[PDB]
Curated annotation (Swiss-Prot):
Monomer. This is Para-nitrobenzyl esterase. GO terms for molecular function: cholinesterase activity. Gene3D superfamilies: alpha/beta hydrolase (3.40.50.1820). InterPro entries: AB_hydrolase_fold (IPR029058), CarbesteraseB (IPR002018), Carboxylesterase_B_AS (IPR019826), Carboxylesterase_B_CS (IPR019819), Cholinesterase (IPR000997), Type-B_Carboxylest/Lipase (IPR050309). It is an enzyme of class 3 (hydrolase). Signal peptide: none annotated. The keyword Transcription does not apply. The modification Phosphoserine is found at residue 188. Disulfide bonds: none annotated. It comes from Bacillus subtilis (strain 168). Keywords: Hydrolase, Phosphoprotein, Serine esterase.
Amino acid sequence: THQIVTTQYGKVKGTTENGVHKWKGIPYAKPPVGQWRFKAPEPPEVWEDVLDATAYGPVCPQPSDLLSLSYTELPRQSEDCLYVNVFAPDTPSQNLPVMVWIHGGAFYLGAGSEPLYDGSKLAAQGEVIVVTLNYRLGPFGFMHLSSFDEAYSDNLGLLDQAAALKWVRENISAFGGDPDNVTVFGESAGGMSIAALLAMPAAKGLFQKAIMESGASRTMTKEQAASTAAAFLQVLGINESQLDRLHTVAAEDLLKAADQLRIAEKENIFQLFFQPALDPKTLPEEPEKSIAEGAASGIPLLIGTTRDEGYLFFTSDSDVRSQETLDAALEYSLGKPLAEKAADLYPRSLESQIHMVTDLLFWRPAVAFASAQSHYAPVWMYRFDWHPEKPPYNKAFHALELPFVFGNLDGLERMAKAEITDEVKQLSHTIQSAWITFAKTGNPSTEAVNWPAYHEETRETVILDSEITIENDPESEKRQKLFPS
Ligand SMILES: [K+]
């Protein structure tokens, strides 16, 4: 019970608190600094002594936008941030299911060690092992420089995630987990990351189940990645013959250059900037297309969205964008005729731009991905509708389901100033129980919900709220407008 575990790179020692074994700050890669900046993750150097794993490692450098809201006491920031944390229930049971969390944050914010993602409650209540991790963000993980040097890798942040999953496959049995029953789950950018991981060469065979919360196929073109990369170096004053400077410039300067590029670009309604990029070596094609062709055959998928995603993207006082902007977003998302028709579904207004974000950034992608995967594996869909009744937090905002999934309800106070009532505790128990049962069997059904499989003929969907219900082909009129006739 003293919790010393031998990893492939050396021994680590954790602790036990309230029935949960915990190991924090375990290195899964060599710190991506200096010459290793902008390169694929390398194995960390081995150590012969016992590494103290009772404190979280640093988080990736980033603006304080999310950290200030997520933490009461800000964490240390460093490019040396590639660490995983393990939470396991103190039980005689072996070969436990493993749930690996990929945090959201628009690919430039967040950390696996944010208070909201503490896996103690999930591990204890479900008797599963929970793994959280950090991956390179912003200019460190999603600045695709392959166009300047083949030695550099694009989609660095995704490669870090894959490296962490590889670490889990090779080391989790030593922590009491089943390396052959690994469920990867994530929200927002984390869900979008999982869409990519389900198709990436780097992640082949590294997990057996997936949960995608408010996130699906999302990428920028190879051309867009290259143009942004060139603009980035220009801001830094680095020439094609001064690439060595990319490994010496201060991290703070990389962040400043990144922030400078954003402000220079008129913000879009989806607030998209950093994101995965198409690249022959790391992400050959759009995740949705790859899944539609069977790249994730046999991998059960639990996927969903919140009813009011878009309300977190605007304020009642936000400016109303032009019709041309909305039509541009429609063409981008939909296509040629799909944009033409159904365009009348979003007449200029604050309401329409809110609905467009919910529909085009989250709902349509989720339905498209779920439908595609339904031909190759069991799929289960949900729509989260819960929220406090009193304004102004009376909307099922993007990310509002997170406190329920992890069981860390203090997060609801900062997200919606909501009180932890019996209804809230009950809903968290129901949602967490479903996530756990899915990790264990590939079917999210519980005593509170007999979940119907999602397929294109009936599109049966579970509605998560104080009272669980099922809707058959929800928002059918909207679906018919957003998809080919
Ligand atoms: K022991």
